Design a protein around this ligand. Structure first.
Ligand SMILES: [Mg+2]
Lengths: 342, 336, 75, 37, 56, 230, 112, 62, 217
RNA sequence: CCCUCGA
């Protein structure tokens, strides 16, 4: 542990498709026989954990060690050298964490509801610490819309212009935000003095925030930010409730009627074929048009039937992982299949 | 000179002592001094014993030896042959490969204490945690369906069948109308348990020893976070799944070399764990190193870490003596 | 430098403040590595110029030196 | 440097020694496996 | 139970096109369309189907 | 069986009312067995005084508006909740705040009845314009943790949220260091009020927890893991 | 220790038997003797038959081929019955893994 | 000719290089890679390779 | 504020529930879990360290006339539950000649150490089978894998064995939350392995927890 | 080099 300290090592994963396929790290001695690989560098290596292996190289000379620390260190290589955009961004579980943390739920526990009659509004909190204590009891939901007095978070450009000077603000200046406690915590992950983002953190929105940080803040700032985002995304993905069961794979209710309709059309086309009116290639062409359309309608009637909080829908629509034609083949229908000839 | 049956052996332990005739010119000056002083008239030899390879350990299960003195079929010039058999009891570990039957492979990220695992309402800690994000896009919900059936068979069921047998159970089930705990059932491919029948069994699941139904009619369950104690806020699918230990284990795969054998033709490190080889820093790797502009790392990798036969020794010597690493020489493979 | 989390290990001193002291990352590599060679030769030829850690590698000392502007360079 | 622009990896203007040919070849090749018919 | 496409008298690996590796409609009930390697031997190594038998 | 004694406890004081405590090295797993427990004892189990309800004369019909004050009613409640108070009475106590004229009202601007104290007297509560006047009644009680609005027919009595707990925010993290790289290291980040230092908060929590687990030890005093140094 | 799957198909048993690593009775009889080392069945013929157990043999790939008797002395066995389990068999069926209590959920990124 | 022969069509390139008595200036990076010299890129450029490092008189005093 | 009380409730000889009330709201789960995590991990016990079998020099072999190989015998010896007060290695002996079952009851323990499940199956012997075993028992806690023969001074005959010291079997809890004076009632449920009683294990967990929480005080 | 396998 004495000699290992601060001596960087290079990690490589083949195939090295670009220079970020080799990155330097500081080694922590670990128990066991496996290399532990920070989850945010996977994208760069195209590494998953289904059995991938990686190579370790020890720089010896002062020059090689310095090139490792300076040129090749992982946190100095956050941005893709091909597109100039960041790559060490929250990817799947992290996404579902943050998307769950920053979504606003109408009617959730402890929601702000304005003063009606003799009753006060019962949704306002003197500090985020008070909202934390509320959520310790079963009183406040992390995703419930509330009002909080914020002190250490910069207000939105519009709120800050209204209630202060255009750039006038300080860590002391308090203000009133109608947000969720989750979005308070998210923004507390971002750097001090970044305009408060009151949005559900779809992957695209997180990409926007991190692109802006990389454009306007030093590298180390983006690196510490995405580390904090990682921590929160994992902790909240665990508690997000995204699981799979045969129950959550809802089937489209109109599926029989839709498919019978397009079979009616296909029977018309085949009766038209035997009559001699359609060439064989034209028969297959009309059949493929019909069945593309039926598959599309089945996919639609599926999307119309899924509640927006189903774990399959959530996982796809947050941008965490997957796409919707996968959901359509899972529940719904596979559709048309290719030939050995294509 | 053979290791004794039943010995525990670690890295580098002699398994069979052997010596090879060496020749006086190949004695080191220290070996020559020692042999002269103490009047060792024994033939000069070098140690060519069979040792235990790096990272291997176990119990000597059996020794088998064939001799030329005895009438034993041996290849030409071969005098004595001996096989030591070593047995290791490998536990499951971080880095081992597991998989179900539905292409659902992973390596083990962490083995948690029993108290850290999420556990059911009766204290039963779950055995394995499979990430949700991995299932839907690989199109293998067989693994989920199995899980459901795995739970049912583990708990046992009894369909009502009072006031008639239900509709979902009408088609197939017959003597599958009930099952004792840890029952053994078969889902033949393309003729197995239908979806409705599967959902039906999830209702009539028998309880545990306290009359508690731990898994609801969706296949989900309330789990407590063993780390904090607070319950996880949402019902998690739990059940029983057949998991296999795939023959891709860390013990076989971990490998590291500071320094070792070299190929006689090229003077570059040998290849492969078995030969105590060095990793191949290939062409695309050198492109990566060039694109960084990491010139000295690239040179050092390509001269003193493989090919420079004097710089190798002078570099190990420098590191051992605590001084700066010297300047590379010429790669032997260029002269080749 | 204001409000920033104090970096840990290799990521300290931060590379932006170090790149303020040199023209390009390559210049900094050579700067620090040549200073580090000097430091390690000293233990067997000036320096170290800052308080060395308990058991600090000479390159870490050289980097902290470059951060505190305790040495000069030309190209 | 000025004609090339910023180094995409660093965000700042490209440093005087950069081997941008290899970075260019790598940037073009890396997604090549995505190109289908 | 394997059926291998390479070997002396068979076809060579440099001549292993893509169409010899496809699932062929005549494989039904004879060569399993699922069990085959993912890497360079895909479609060159199959395994006999459960009820299949080789004739004289 | 045999015992290990090494765990120690150190403190880095970030601000006068915020400290980080490290407990290390703990035998593996114990960082989490006393991470969450210490935290919830710190939050909900330390007794403290806070406001339960206020009455503001001058406006009882239309809530969330006050004449002659630039501050909303909701903002006045948000301020009065952040008023740090300590009291010795086992019964509710009443304070009164009255100040007129254009100016700025603060926390010391209130007259504390006997026994109770106002620890943040320079805390801004409201600003008054010309012809401005404030007369408002505050109820202080003893309690623990955080209880929401606890609600009669007395026209004009606004119940508030009671931040009884002297401590404000607590987080914890478990890291790894050992003799073995897997023993647990607990790190508690505790930020309190002006009533007590983080030190005293941690000590009172340790006291309540020692009593609580002594309840269990009492079943049959017997063999368990011991230390040499405390 | 091998453990057949709670959930299987009809194929496990018949794949173990035909694979050959399972010891099967050539003829009906009674178990005259059983040890870890071998198994003797006395046929109704009057003839005996003894199956020696492969004990901790090394496979071509380094896995342990260890046959284990599943019959008891006095037991009646018919021709075609499995007498001893092989490396990945349990009472005659192919048992390649274990039945594990699984939860489907993210857990703090350790299963990321 | 070294760069060409190591890339592709080695026999042809080498026959021609022989006929033409080609002399490789050994200036490309790949060529420098092959022989073991610091590539002319990044830290291997003379601008950076030959930096002179010494403390300041003020810091050398204390 | 009423002082909290802990009241036991026996279910079987090796299972007890433990009601603790009144507790602060939201606090029951954490308290029960601190107890569960201590019970599962840190309750002292005794177990077998190593064994020595007469004709065998290593694990991977058979004894004549016995049905189980030595690996299967050791696996059966994993289920063995035992107590010891000697806190220093002590030896049990097991001599038996077939035909017949060898159960744990056939083990001859020394004074101070006790075998709790005599029915447990160890081996099956026939006419030609004789089993002659020595079993070292020590006192420890947690799960300690087989101690290597080079860590101890052990000679080639000794077969080290994985040691499951923990005498507690299964621990759970539930809270009843009353929610204005709100409170939490905690109900711990502890089942042991006949080596000790739920009450004794919980007392041990409480001692460990008291001595560890006295640190902040 | 080839064979079978791994990402
Ligand atoms: Mg992979």
């Amino acid at each position: 542990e004495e000699v290992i300290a601060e001596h960087p090592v290079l990690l490589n994963r083949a195939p090295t498709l670009h220079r970020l396929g080799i990155q330097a790290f500081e080694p922590m001695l670990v128990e066991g026989k496996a290399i532990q690989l920070h989850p945010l560098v996977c994208e760069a290596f195209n590494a998953d954990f289904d059995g991938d292996q990686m190579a370790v190289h020890l720089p010896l000379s002062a020059e090689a060690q310095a090139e490792a620390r300076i040129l090749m260190l992982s946190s100095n290589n956050i941005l893709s050298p091909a597109s100039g955009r960041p790559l060490a961004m929250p990817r799947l579980d992290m996404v579902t964490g943050l998307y769950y943390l920053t979504t606003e739920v109408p009617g959730d526990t402890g929601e702000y509801q304005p003063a009606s009659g003799d009753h006060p509004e019962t949704g306002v909190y003197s500090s985020p610490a008070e909202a934390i204590m509320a959520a310790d009891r079963g009183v406040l939901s992390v995703r419930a819309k509330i009002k909080v007095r914020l002190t250490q978070l910069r207000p939105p450009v519009e709120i800050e212009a209204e209630l202060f000077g255009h750039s006038g603000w300080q860590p002391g200046d308090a203000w009133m935000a109608e947000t969720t406690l989750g979005r308070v915590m998210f923004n507390e992950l971002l750097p001090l003095g970044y305009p408060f983002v009151n949005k559900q953190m779809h992957k695209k929105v997180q990409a926007a925030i991190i692109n802006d940080l990389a454009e306007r803040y030093p590298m180390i700032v983006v690196a510490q930010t995405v580390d904090k985002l990682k921590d929160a995304g994992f902790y909240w993905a665990t508690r997000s409730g995204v699981t799979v069961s045969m129950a959550d794979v809802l089937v489209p209710p109109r599926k029989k009627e839709i498919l019978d309709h397009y079979e009616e059309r296909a029977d018309k086309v085949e009766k038209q074929f035997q009559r001699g009116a359609l060439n064989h290639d034209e028969r297959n062409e009309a059949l493929v048009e019909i069945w593309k359309e039926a598959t599309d309608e089945v996919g639609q009637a599926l999307r119309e039937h899924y509640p927006d909080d189903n774990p399959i829908i959530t996982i796809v629509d947050s941008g965490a992982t997957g796409n919707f034609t996968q959901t359509r083949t899972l529940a719904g229908m596979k559709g048309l299949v290719t030939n050995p000839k294509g | 000179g053979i290791v004794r049956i039943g010995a525990e052996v670690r890295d580098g332990d002699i398994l069979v002592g052997k010596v090879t005739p060496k020749g006086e010119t190949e004695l080191t000056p220290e070996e020559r001094l020692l042999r002269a002083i103490f009047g060792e008239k024994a033939r000069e030899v070098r140690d060519t014993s069979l040792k235990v390879p790096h990272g291997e350990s176990g119990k000597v299960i059996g020794i088998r030896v064939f001799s030329r003195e005895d009438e034993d079929e041996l290849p030409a010039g071969v005098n004595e042959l001996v096989r030591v058999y070593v047995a290791q009891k490998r536990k499951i570990s971080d880095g081992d490969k597991l998989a179900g039957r539905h292409g659902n492979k992973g390596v083990i990220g962490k083995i948690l204490p029993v108290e850290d695992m999420p556990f059911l309402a009766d204290g039963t800690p779950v055995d394995i945690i499979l990430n949700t994000h991995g299932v839907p896009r690989r199109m293998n919900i067989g693994q989920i369906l199995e899980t459901h059936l795995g739970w049912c068979a583990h708990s046992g069921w009894k369909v009502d069948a009072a006031k008639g047998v239900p509709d979902w159970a009408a088609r197939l089930p017959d003597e599958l109308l009930e099952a004792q705990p840890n029952a053994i059932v078969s889902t033949p491919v393309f003729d197995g348990a239908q979806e409705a029948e599967l959902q039906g069994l999830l209702s009539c699941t028998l309880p545990n020893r306290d009359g508690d139904v731990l898994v609801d009619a969706d296949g989900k369950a309330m789990l407590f976070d063993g780390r904090s104690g607070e319950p996880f806020p949402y019902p998690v699918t739990v059940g029983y799944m057949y998991i296999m230990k795939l023959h891709h284990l860390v013990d076989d795969k971990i490998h590291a070399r500071s320094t070792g054998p070299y190929s006689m033709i090229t003077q570059q490190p040998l290849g492969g764990k078995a030969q105590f080889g060095g990793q191949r820093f290939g062409e695309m790797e050198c492109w990566a190193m060039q694109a960084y502009g990491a010139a000295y790392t690239l040179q050092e990798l390509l001269t003193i870490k493989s090919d420079d036969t004097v710089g190798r020794v002078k570099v190990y010597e420098a590191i051992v003596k605590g001084e700066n690493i010297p300047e590379p020489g010429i790669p032997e493979s260029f002269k080749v | 430098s204001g409000g920033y989390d104090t970096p840990l290990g290799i990521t300290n001193p931060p590379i932006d403040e170090l790149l303020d002291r040199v023209s390009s990352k390559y210049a900094l590599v050579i700067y620090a590595a040549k200073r580090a060679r000097q430091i390690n030769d000293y233990y067997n030829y000036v320096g170290p110029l800052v308080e060395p850690g308990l058991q600090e590698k000479p390159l870490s000392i050289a980097l902290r030196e470059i951060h505190a502007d305790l040495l000069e360079h030309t190209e | 440097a000025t004609c090339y622009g910023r180094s995409m990896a660093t965000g700042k203007l490209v440093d005087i020694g950069e081997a941008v040919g290899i970075v260019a070849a790598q940037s073009i090749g890396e997604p090549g496996t995505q190109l289908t018919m | 139970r394997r059926l291998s496409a390479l070997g002396p008298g068979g076809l060579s690996r440099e001549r292993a096109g893509l169409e010899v590796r496809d699932v062929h409609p005549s494989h039904y009930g004879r060569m399993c369309p699922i069990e085959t390697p993912e890497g360079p031997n895909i479609g060159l190594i199959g395994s006999l189907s459960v009820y299949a038998r080789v004739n004289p | 069986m045999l015992i290990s004694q090494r765990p120690t406890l150190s403190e880095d004081v970030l601000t006068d009312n915020r400290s980080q405590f490290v407990i290390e090295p703990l035998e593996p797993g114990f960082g989490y067995t006393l991470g969450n427990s210490l935290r919830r004892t710190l939050l909900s189990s330390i007794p403290g005084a806070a406001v339960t309800s206020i009455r503001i004369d001058g406006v009882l019909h239309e809530f969330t508006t006050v004449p002659g004050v630039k501050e909303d009613v909701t903002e006045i409640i948000l301020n009065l909740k952040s008023l740090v108070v300590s009291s010795e009475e086992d019964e509710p106590v009443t304070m009164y705040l009255r100040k007129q004229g254009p100016g700025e009202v603060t926390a010391g601007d209130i007259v504390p009845p006997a026994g109770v104290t106002v620890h943040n007297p320079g805390m801004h509560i409201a600003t008054l314009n010309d012809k401005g006047k404030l007369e408002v009644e505050l109820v202080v009680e003893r309690g623990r943790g955080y209880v929401p609005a606890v609600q009669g027919a007395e026209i004009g009595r606004i119940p508030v949220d009671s931040i009884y707990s002297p401590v404000l925010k607590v987080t914890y993290k478990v890291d790894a260091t050992r003799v073995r790289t897997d023993f647990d290291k607990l790190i508690l980040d505790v930020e309190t009020k002006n009533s007590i230092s983080p030190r005293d908060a941690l000590a009172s929590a340790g006291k309540t927890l020692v009593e609580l687990f002594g309840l269990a030890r009492e079943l049959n005093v017997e063999a368990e893991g011991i230390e040499i140094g405390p | 220790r091998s453990e057949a799957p709670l959930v299987g198909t009809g194929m496990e048993l018949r794949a173990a038997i035909d694979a050959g690593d399972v010891v099967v009775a050539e003829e009906s009889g009674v178990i005259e003797e059983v040890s870890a080392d071998y198994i003797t069945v006395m046929h109704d013929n009057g003839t005996r038959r003894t199956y020696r157990m492969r004990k901790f043999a090394r496979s071509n790939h380094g896995t342990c081929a260890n046959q284990c008797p599943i019959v008891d002395a006095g037991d009646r066995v018919e021709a075609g019955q499995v007498i001893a389990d092989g490396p990945c068999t349990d009472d005659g069926e192919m048992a390649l893994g274990k039945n594990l209590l699984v939860a489907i959920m993210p857990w703090e990124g350790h299963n990321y | 000719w070294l760069s060409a022969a190591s890339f592709q069509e080695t026999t042809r390139v080498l026959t021609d290089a022989a006929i033409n008595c080609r002399s490789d200036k050994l200036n490309g990076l790949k060529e420098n890679v092959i022989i073991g010299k610091l590539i002319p890129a990044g830290t291997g450029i003379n601008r950076y390779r030959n930096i002179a490092v010494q403390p300041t008189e003020e810091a050398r005093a204390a």
